[PDB]
Design a protein around this ligand. Structure first.
Ligand SMILES: O=C(N[C@@H](Cc1cc(=O)[nH]c2ccccc12)C(=O)O)c1ccc(Cl)cc1
Lengths: 257, 256
């Protein structure tokens, strides 16, 4: 077969509890005090204190469970994952790790943190990139990250508020580089990143021309949490095609009220 | 203090997947075939076939997690639940069970199924009540129900398309009958019912029950596993609302 799977990260803390979520779970002294059961028991310590979460928020408890279930669904369908890459966004690393937990592969597979899979940098606030936890420190928080992996696009080569074309171009360049270095090692590749990744990583893989920016944004906003798409290589053509994913979709509603 | 905990059931299968949800997860021959990871691995075989679900829908996978977490939160607060009662709706009994799982008390405790705790019957479709699974059949699905339990208001004594006055009374009466029999047994009692139940059961145990229009508004504002706490003001017999012993639970949808 040989497949490439691209899925979106889990439910975001800064979506459910809004842009001022740190207000609701950190006190004056900076102690994490959860005020909701959807908040995790504890948050990992960061190199810049809790304010590094403002532009790089973690997934919720239900975000972990979405990720666990997709992993459990891959195992149940005997869908073997040989390689896993993720965006350097904390929400993506956490999703990837929780998929490995559901996959029962926490202690075998080591996640390849690729900054080239970070979403369109136009969607970052201010004139500074997020303070992404380095692989070495993600590993030191139990998250099953490969600290050996050489990134195709380092953090230093990412542009602040890049053009649509810059984002689409690097998304394509990095996906071919990912595919190229996994030609030898294994069949199936899982990418855990953003809504934008599912289209930007696959669009030009099929030989097709990319969408215009406004069509792209509309496609991207219809992709749910842990939204999962699939690409099979057509023979040895080098072109890949989208296919019915190996697992069922995942749809739940809100808490309500 | 001596507490009464009233909480709504978990996420409904028939809300997420619509009114035609049996169309999506049952084929010609009545074989359950899930089409989404939020649908459970399997559904219990029902007395009168699969069509009995049409009016008594089960909670989703994420429905069970909502319940589990509420249960786990009760455990962590050092809150010992001494007696647990619930509506005869499958969603309510499934919620009740997953709270006991969350409490690590599936074996120790047994759920008291009370038809008197069922929601306002005006919200029933057709001219017939839902074909509820009897406490005997529920315990045969590994759901930790108390087959012993003598219901204060049995099914046969429930009126189809009842009035707002009849509901608040039967909700008030059953709550007192629940408080009465527990007096000695333990301290804290847990009701597991519907969005209506949280108001109807603790309104006049504290006040004049609100009008029908004001009620419906308050009900639709209560989330899945929404949780309120009442405590007896001494031995006076007048109970009052209090900041619950556990945090609330808020999550968004799948989206798109
Ligand atoms: O929903 C957010 N992000 C999106 C990407 C995204 C980001 C953006 O700025 N504008 C957009 C417009 C159209 C489409 C997508 C975007 C994602 O998760 O895929 C999001 C971002 C910040 C916070 Cl505090 C909370 C939530």
């Amino acid at each position: 077969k040989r497949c490439l799977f691209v899925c979106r990260h889990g439910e975001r803390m800064d979506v459910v509890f809004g842009k001022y979520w740190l207000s609701q779970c950190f006190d004056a002294k900076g102690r994490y005090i959860r005020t909701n059961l959807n908040m995790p028991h504890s948050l990992p310590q960061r190199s810049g204190g809790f304010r590094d979460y403002e532009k790089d928020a973690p997934i919720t408890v239900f975000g972990c469970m979405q990720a666990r279930l997709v992993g459990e669904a891959l195992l149940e369908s005997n869908t073997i994952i040989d390689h896993v890459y993720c965006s350097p966004s904390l929400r993506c690393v956490q999703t990837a790790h929780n998929i490995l937990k559901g996959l029962q592969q926490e202690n075998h597979l080591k996640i390849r943190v690729e900054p080239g899979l970070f979403e369109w940098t136009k969607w970052v606030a201010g004139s500074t990139l997020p303070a992404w936890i380095p692989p070495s420190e993600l590993a030191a928080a139990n998250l099953s990250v490969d600290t050996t992996y050489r990134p195709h696009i380092p953090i230093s080569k990412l542009v602040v508020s890049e053009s649509y074309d810059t984002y689409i171009s690097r998304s394509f360049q990095v996906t071919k580089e990912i595919i190229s270095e996994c030609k030898s090692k294994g069949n199936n590749i899982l990418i855990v990143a953003h809504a934008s990744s599912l289209e930007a990583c696959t669009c030009q893989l099929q030989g097709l021309s990319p969408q215009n920016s406004k069509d792209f944004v509309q496609m991207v906003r219809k992709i749910p949490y842990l939204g999962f798409c699939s690409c099979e290589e057509l023979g040895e053509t080098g072109i890949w095609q989208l296919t019915d994913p190996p697992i069922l979709p995942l749809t739940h509603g809100p808490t309500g009220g």
